[model samples]
Target: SLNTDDIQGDILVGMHKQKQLFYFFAINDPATFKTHLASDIAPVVASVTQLSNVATQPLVALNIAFSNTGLLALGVTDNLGDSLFANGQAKDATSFKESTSSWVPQFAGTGIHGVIILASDTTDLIDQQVASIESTFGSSISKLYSLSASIRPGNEAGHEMFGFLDGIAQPAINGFNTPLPGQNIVDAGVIITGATNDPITRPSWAVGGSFLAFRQLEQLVPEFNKYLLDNAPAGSGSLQARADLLGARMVGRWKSGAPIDLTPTADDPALGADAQRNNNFTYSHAGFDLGSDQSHCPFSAHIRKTRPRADLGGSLTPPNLSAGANSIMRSGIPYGPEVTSAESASNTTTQERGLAFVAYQAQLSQGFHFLQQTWADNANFPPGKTPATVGLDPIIGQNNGQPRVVNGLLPSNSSASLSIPQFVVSHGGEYFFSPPISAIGGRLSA
Candidate 1:
């Protein structure tokens, strides 16, 4: 069984946070930082059970993760084999390069050693907790950068800035609970280190730790909305109908969170909200016979490209790879303000907004990097499908100014292809390691 007290709250049972603050800091003095972290900050870092308690008003949760530079700052010389971590985000950006120049400077050459994440129900509590943490660190650390994000206002609370329900799909940890039907159940190593299924070669002190992938994605809402309005399939139906179809095709789910594969023709808000139905579908069957035939879900839909279901069989994976080896536990929030009416009217983005993407996993290479490079970035993914070029993921796949394409648009079997512009842009990101509580208080301390 998993030990709730040893693990961070947001990694497993996520926080229903109304507001969150991410503080990126650079270590000035390693010894001072470690002493203060162990003596002062360690006790306050929220565990799973403590965070779940209703009596804890404002519902505060805290977690700390370190970068490669951070490990060096502490005088740890052992290298983690993950190429993604060794190179850091700035170097990794070269491969998955973003078109926007505004993104590069945010992360490049920024000496970010570690990050402190604070989440709460109210901004006041968050501020209090942040101040407490800063005071605890004192002069040992320097605040390199910070980003504050919140749940969207009113009904959009659980949805992303693009108006789509977020966090609908997630992998279930092996010992955590009974796996739901069609839910990928992974062994402990897929999330927590030094557990069954984790590489046996890891350092003893690294046990019970987890890897974190952080990304700052800025969405151009006005441009996205305008594209849906203008290029929505012609002769499809009414303006709204065409827009909805185009939106569903792009995301592989309706705004209501309904997977297009289940409710292909129209949006099913009722079906979308139901936990049992929302995630209960496989793209292909046991014998690798394409189950739904990509008729309902396109070959390159965002979700399908990301998860693939049974589309790519277990036989295709490595021998030791678990059922959900590529899965990640996402705990992210939308940043910036909602789009203003003036910006919407002008079809331009004056206000900044998008996802502060955060994901937790045991191995960075097997999880986030695998999903991004092997699946999302690969145009010919969902292998064994016809048409050599299934095209890039319309929502996130970067084509470097090339027109993105996807098959199986409505009026199925038609020769016409749907071309899409890259809507979501990657701003900046880095890999982090959230060590076990024991390590924080013991080995990592003096």
Candidate 2:
């Protein structure tokens, strides 16, 4: 059984409230920090059980995690057993094809020891929580950097700034969460250490914890909209409608969250809104050629590239293809302001806006890193298609900042190709381990 009390709250069920704060800090006084962290913070740290349901969730939930350097700063000598975590994000930045100068100054080094995640329903409540934390910690720790993220305003709530509904398809943990109709069901170990499918070895105290991958992805919304309008498929409908269709093909889902595979020509808001059916397509249907058919959805579509579903084959046959081993417990909240009329008119982004992408897993290599490197970034991913190759994930893929190409936006022509500018820009990110609350108070703290 899972240790619900010790596992951090956000790892399993995300803290996707009105406001979420990421406070990256450096441990100034390690000895004092440990003592205070165990005594005062431990009592307030939210647990998996605590935040599972709204009735039990606190007004402001808190979770603290440490980087490899952060653990060293606290005198931790034992290895956590994940190499990706041991080496820091900057060192592995090249693996993600990220440039050194592209990262925030603080994130470009090992200065940040740990990060505290705080989430609450309103900014006012989060302010008081931040106020109290600054007062309580005093000089024991100091902020290296901080960011605030939240859901969009009005009808845009639960949607990313690109005007698409997110948080649709997450792997359901076997023992922890119930699966939706087409949701991938994985073992708890896929997300929590020491569980059934987890691959890495760890110290006893680290058993229930999960690695947190944080990325600050800035989206050039205005520019992307213009690109869609300018390069829309050759068709007869209104410019906006054609552009919307092209975008839907790339994303594999409409703004409302319906998969293009199921609704190729038009959007089905009813299916999008239904939890039971929205995620129910495997991209394989009668009379459809999985290898050569981009007729329904492009192979390079963001969702299709990320989670191949039947493209990889049916459930649990080959051990390596098990979704449990590669899936991540995902969460993301958009940051920055909404696009303005001036920016839209000019079709240029004067200010930044994008997702504060967060993903949790027992190991980075199997979860976050693998998805980005092996699948999304690799143009030949999901090998063995009739054409022998598809293209990079259109939404987030990178060819080191060069333009990317994708096939199949037109149902009439399967070989049709379009070259597009990179829409998502990486602002750098870091990796951290959310050690069990017990570790926070016992092994590491003691």
Candidate 3:
């Protein structure tokens, strides 16, 4: 069994709402705060069983997680056995090429002890929960920072800032879900702590715990849109069609959510909207003769570099442990506003926005941390392709604010270079342990 009752509501299946508030706070009195957490907060913390359906879901669904420093401050001495989590995300910032200067000051070090992720359909509901938390905890804590975020409105509800369908292709866990076609099915150990296939060594009480990785990714939508329009392929079609093609190639999918691997020359709106067929293609297909062919999907495409499904050979079972092994359960939502007319004309940004990226996994080193450091930032990843030098991830890979050159854009010439800039900039974030709600009062409080 997956212990769904003990797990947080957000981990198994995201408790997605229209509005969310990330309250980053520090403990004023650890002794008193610890008691308050288990007594008052534990009873109401949303669990998987409670959020199984709309009828059962609470008005405000909240999950709590504490940082490494936060745990230490509470006098918990047990080590979680993940070096990356112990040292924290800030120390490993350089490995992912994150610029410390861009980080929000409170997230830089030990200033933030824990985060209260509160979500609801209405802002008013979320605020009421925040007030209750403050009233219960009294003056035992102080808010370090806060980020109020929401999904885009109306037609753009589930799309990211750059105008593409977001949150797709979750690695279906064996016990937790029925795998859709082409969706990677992984062992539960890949996401939950102390499970059968779990890679990390942890304290016995940590069996149901999972690590939460947070990052404030700022997207330059105006800059990104302009690049696609200016670089519209040299041929015909409506200028809009040509421009959209360029964008689709960069992301490995059309804005409508169809994969380039399936429909190379044009987008298929029906296929894009069909959940059954949307994720059903491997780069290796009848259209290409070689496994390394970029005739359909580019080697440097966002999805290709991160998931090289067929490139790592077929089976992702025990002995292989390929790209499928580094899977994470993503629960991120978009932040920021629609680009203004002035900003669009200038091809720049004046507002604060992007993705408030959040991911959950059993081991930080094997999942989120590995994908960023080894796969995304590395130039020669998804290794040993025909032309070689596959290049950095155009969207997230950074070279310290320097220009990047990625190859494989045009199907006519697979080795064409596309000069890319850092469209997604991050100042880095924090890693927190969200333990079983039952442990809140027992192992943690005492």
Candidate 4:
């Protein structure tokens, strides 16, 4: 049964965000955590569902999802004053790697239990909501945790910082209801950890739970623009035209999120307009191997690097056997202000804007990390064809913790030295484990 009460409000409908906040903290007392959660959490859950219908004038959106950390496993949900002792090690790899550039502060040692994501149109409203949560909910819990944020426009209307129209590739839920055309239906175990086909060795109480990975990636706008301008095709067309062309060549889509596979000649806004059509096709292109030349979509395109549907399929190489369980439910919003002229002239980003990339999956190894390292980072992916030097993902790929060169125009020019603009930057992030609905009623607390 589709129990609305059990599922997070944002899962199906999605939150309309202008300003958003993610709060992470540990529970000091399990008994108190459960008590406070029962009271405070219930209201917020109801409020989130109700907020869905509220007009966008005031920017209405659903704020949902709460997760647990390993600290809770050690019976450390109580006595919250000791920050050093309470921090969990589960999110170390994510937090440390993202904070290397000094963009966002490093939260190397933070024991986090629950994360509250709130969305609103105005900063004032967001602040008010936070205040309400802290005041009413803070009293009963042992420790207080939160992170305030706001949503900004993405490069492409519906895309993420990496210029890919993300969240478009959602798996159809089984046993529930209607499934979209060409929509792949995955087992509940794919998103929910410890379920039937789930690979992780989770606690018995974590059967239907999922792990959440939150990342705050900042964009270097000017540098990105500069790279695009400097490498613009001489005969492509006007500046805007060239930029559009370059964007399509770099990613596999037009600014409107239309995939090049569908629109081979030029961008068709109509195709991008239809959600049912846009994410419908795969990279069924002729010779798009990891080592081969990318004629349609670049080897480092975000969609290709992240999913690699073709690379993993119809291949003689070792296939990605865990493909089914690797799917993730990605829910994130762009953050910060738009680009400035001075920064643009300097070819760098002066603003603190990009993406609050958050994804939910049954396993981390097969999901985010696999997409980034195994597919995006691996130069020899998408396996087949010529001009065999495919690099990292131009938009989101990083090398030695720095932006990697993406050869977008290599296929068109063969020997062409086209490099991608550094539009996306990694700031800070953390990993969290969303508990099952059953856990709330069981031993699970804050």
Candidate 5:
């Protein structure tokens, strides 16, 4: 059985994040840090559930989740917006030649102690909460390590830059299985590796812990709109109609959250309206390899590529890697704003908007990286019946591979492939580990 106390609420029912601020600070003195965290910090942890308020009307707020290492011993460090944290790098480097042109952008208005605040909006409560937290924590935040901004929000209420209702299709934990139909159910190991089924060999202190991958994916709105509009399907008349069709094909679901698997030809207003029924169904069928199926869902649609439920079946075959392999609990929010008039006129993104992609897993290799690199970024994935040539996922899919084309025209058994344009793009990010509650209590050490 799963105990609420054993796990932080953010891991499961994520902290309802509207305007969240993460203040990362160093531990100045080990003895003071230990004593303050154990005593003063302990009460805050206990009060987090009350502070989060997901039980009430959709929380208008920010919530804090914190961690730190004994720097000199662990060699842990932070340089806000100074270095690019690539997706698959195993070792930390003070400098790496990637994007962001030498300096990464910092989150606006950040303070100390790795604090996070949630509110209806940032303007409404963030400043007030920061003032209070700063006062309470007092010298603890100021004297310690440097602080950085991890503050952000999602683009369209609950959707990422890719347009699908993210954080919606999470897998239910093992041992506790009342997952609604269609909603994925996975092992505890899938979310928290090393503790039980993690393949990596880590020290005893690392068991039961989960890693967090944070990415600030900036969406190129006007450019994306132009591409979709200019290349809307031939028969679809109005731009809205063409865009809607293209969106459905890209995500296997419409902007309203209805999965194309069931509503292949049209949108189901009722299903889209029902939360309990919206995300319930498995892509398991005799002929449907789950990996490749244009007849139902596209081979490279965002959700399919991310979790190709049936492609890698639970077979006894040697290289059998099932849907479980790339499963990670997505607990992220979108950041930035809708396209501004000036930026739209220029066909560029002046406003920042994209997913603050976060996931929890025991192994960095199998969790976030695997999903992004092996699946999302791979043109030849969803492994069963590969298309004559696979394409990057219509949303969030890309490869340093080829000049690709996404034909959004729904392929009928009798017709030819449709042609469409691209929508989303990647901008910035870094990965961090959100250790277990026990780790927070100082029960484990370097």
Candidate 6:
């Protein structure tokens, strides 16, 4: 059985947050830092249930993770054998070769030892926690960078800046069996360490620990919205109608969260709001006999590219891999201010706003990296299609000057293609290890 008490709150059951503060710091004095971690930090790190009780206190929660440099600073010389972590974020940026120039400098030279994530229901509580942490560890730790995020206002509370319902699709865990109907259940090791799917031979002290891929993604909301208007497909009655259909085809879901596979022609707000029905359909079936047609949803749609349900069966995935092998437990929050009128009118993003993308998994390569590099970035992914190249994922796909194309948008035929520009920009990030609660006071501490 998975011990909910031992796992960090944000890793499994996410912290309820209206406001969150991310404190990225480096250890200035390792000896004193280790002592502080053992004595002061271990007890205060929030457990799963402790953070879930939003009705009770102010819902203050904390989670800590260490970078590769952090492990070396603590005098642990043994390599974790993960290439992604060994290279760190700054080094990896060279290989990723992101289009944005501002991304690399955010993490390149800074010696970010670890990150302290503090989440709360109010800014006051967040302020208090930040003061408490800084006051206690001021002598040992030095702040590197900090980012503050909160839920968007009014109806956009649970939605991303683009107005689509966010976080609707998630992989169900093996041990925790309250999976909704049609949800794909993955092994515990997909999200937790020391479980069935993990390949790395972790040290005894590292069991139950998971790796985190932390990235700051900025959304070009006005630009994306404008593209929908500019490229509105013809023969869809009105311009608004065409734009809506085009948006749904690209995202694989309506703005209300309804899957295009289920409600192909129109937005179903009722269906989107109901958890029982929102994620109830696979790309293969949705009341119509469109087998891999991309009529209901494009093959290169955001959701389809991220989690290509039955599309990767037979020869696509290996026989040994589990059903949801690529799945990672995502726990992220939207950040930055809403678009200003001037920015929206100009169809440009003047203000910063996007997701504080965070995901936890037992293995780094098999999880986030696999999804981004092997799947999203690859135009010929989810193979065995008539057109060969189904195109890059329009929302998250990053290409270095290559034009992105997606087939099967018009519903007239599956071969019809639409060219798209990259809407999401990478602002750099680092990979870290979130140690087990036991390991904090055990092997990790002085």
TM-score of candidate 5 against the unseen true structure: 0.76
Best by lDDT: 2
lDDT of 3 by residue, 1-446 (tens): 68888889888888768998889998888888988998888888898888887688888888999888888878888988888888888888888866788988877886788899999999999899889889989899899898888999888888888888877768888877887778887888888898758867888878887999999898999988888888777776898888888888888888888889889889998888888888876677654654468878888888877777877777432122346668898888888778899999899899877998999999888788888878777878778787877788777777888867777877778777888888887856799998888777767787
TM-score of each: 0.92, 0.97, 0.96, 0.80, 0.76, 0.93
Question: What does candidate 1's lDDT look like per residue over 212-318, in tens digits?
Answer: 88988889888888888887777647898888887887789999999887787789999889878887777543344463355677878888887877666653321
Residue 143, model 6, lDDT: 83
Clashing pairs in 3: none
- lDDT by residue (288-365, candidate 6, tens digit) is 443457777888888888888777663222111234878888888889988899999999998988889898888788
Ranking by lDDT: 2, 3, 6, 1, 4, 5
TM-score, prediction 3: 0.96
Question: Candidate 4 on 286-373: residue-level lDDT in tens?
Answer: 4444445456676666666676655556432222222555676777777666667777667666667777777776666666766766
Candidate 2 residue lDDT tens string, 236-256: 888888899988998999999
lDDT of each: 0.77, 0.85, 0.83, 0.58, 0.53, 0.79
lDDT of 6 at 417: 78
Worst ten in a row by lDDT for model 3: 315-324
Clash number for every model? 0, 0, 0, 18, 17, 0
**Cα RMSD, each candidate:** 3.1, 2.0, 2.1, 5.3, 6.2, 2.8
